[PDB]
Symmetry: C3
Subunit: 131 residues, 3 copies
Amino acid sequence: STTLAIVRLDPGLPLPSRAHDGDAGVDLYSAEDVELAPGRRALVRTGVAVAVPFGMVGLVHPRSGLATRVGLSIVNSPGTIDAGYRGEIKVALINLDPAAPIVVHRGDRIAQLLVQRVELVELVEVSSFDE
Amino acid sequence: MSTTLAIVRLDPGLPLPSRAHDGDAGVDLYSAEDVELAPGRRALVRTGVAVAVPFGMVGLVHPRSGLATRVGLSIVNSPGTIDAGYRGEIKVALINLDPAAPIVVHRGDRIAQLLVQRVELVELVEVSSFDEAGLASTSR
Amino acid sequence: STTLAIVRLDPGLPLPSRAHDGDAGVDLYSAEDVELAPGRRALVRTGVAVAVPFGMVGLVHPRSGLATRVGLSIVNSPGTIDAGYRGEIKVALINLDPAAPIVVHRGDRIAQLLVQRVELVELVEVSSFDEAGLASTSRGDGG
Ligand SMILES: O=c1ccn([C@H]2C[C@H](O)[C@@H](COP(=O)(O)NP(=O)(O)OP(=O)(O)O)O2)c(=O)[nH]1
Ligand SMILES: O=c1ccn([C@H]2C[C@H](O)[C@@H](COP(=O)(O)NP(=O)(O)OP(=O)(O)O)O2)c(=O)[nH]1
Ligand SMILES: O=c1ccn([C@H]2C[C@H](O)[C@@H](COP(=O)(O)NP(=O)(O)OP(=O)(O)O)O2)c(=O)[nH]1
Ligand SMILES: [Mg+2]
Ligand SMILES: [Mg+2]
Ligand SMILES: [Mg+2]
């Protein structure tokens, strides 16, 4: 078990948690009410900040059910949460349905957060690859 | 020098997903159905397979690059997350992001790729603030 | 400890770099100027080729700033760069804003590249999840 320090910037939301055992991610809540008309986007506060360990990355993924049912997606998916980042996690939701709005209420689960190792590669410039 | 991934062909008529080259990150998933997507429209497509992602790992459903450029095919929830506990059929939320040309998916077409990666099953520890936790000062 | 070999196919762009220590991605440059009208897409050259090590994968992710501010996205995100690939990295940009075109100039940072280990799992066909001792889990076929 890797530990992850989290601050509830919004104390009124539940702490993100694993929907089932072995699940890859924890769901993030919206701190806000917002309505997305077809094709529109918004940057939604989640009410949390995290300290992803050095050598790791946090990844913000859309939820499948809302994706199919209403066309909810994320413009920068997967969103990359860097180890050094100590601000509020924000989710760039977009409505990809052509005709119907998406209604987001505060306290809805709008995205999921995974933590993974990342290779912090040193780039080494070469003149050519070995053919 | 990795593990196996157990896979069921719920639809025995499709080929088993396979890793085309030894280093390729993903195995391609096929469509079990015919579906036509008009511009801007989406569908939830069955792949005909179920997998058993190992505990401590995750399955990741990513788009194929060719179809993305050639016709604007995308996946609404990309990257799709396949959890270790899930034993249902993998489904792909396809969308046509081209403004004008319909995309026709045929049964047997490759529509996505499935990667498997380790994931950290984190224990969240609530802190009152970062300065007060002893871990503020960063690069950002 | 891991290095990534990289060739600047376009010698007039900087080598990609990490914006801050610990950051997961290096930012990729556009080699070209492109204007994307609402809903249109382009395949944009970055001027670099890389050699992802066997056992790893390169992943091309959108940058959050441009995504939120102008609706810039990547059609096949996350773009998968395989260990066997030695061609130029190309980015399938798309303008998801309904009204405003996006202008990209040569030298702009239009995406970021992560490298991660990948599990090169050996697929084994089984008859069913019950017969493989695998039908006992937290979800079943729910989700
Ligand atoms: O964002 C990307 C993604 C891929 N690529 C390159 C790297 C990679 O290994 C290669 C193939 O990726 P896909 O499998 O996603 N495309 P597709 O399955 O259509 O073609 P192929 O038959 O080559 O696998 O294209 C990029 O340059 N940028
Ligand atoms: O979905 C996201 C993605 C990023 N972020 C925060 C966390 C991260 O470390 C940071 C930067 O992400 P990007 O590198 O994708 N954005 P960009 O390159 O535009 O800005 P920067 O100069 O900060 O890296 O923004 C979010 O809150 N939500
Ligand atoms: O692209 C996908 C994504 C997920 N899935 C399956 C696998 C996964 O374990 C499951 C749940 O995924 P999400 O957590 O993204 N969906 P949601 O949060 O809507 O449903 P649930 O309440 O079950 O978690 O659905 C697919 O078949 N295809
Ligand atoms: Mg879920
Ligand atoms: Mg491929
Ligand atoms: Mg950045």
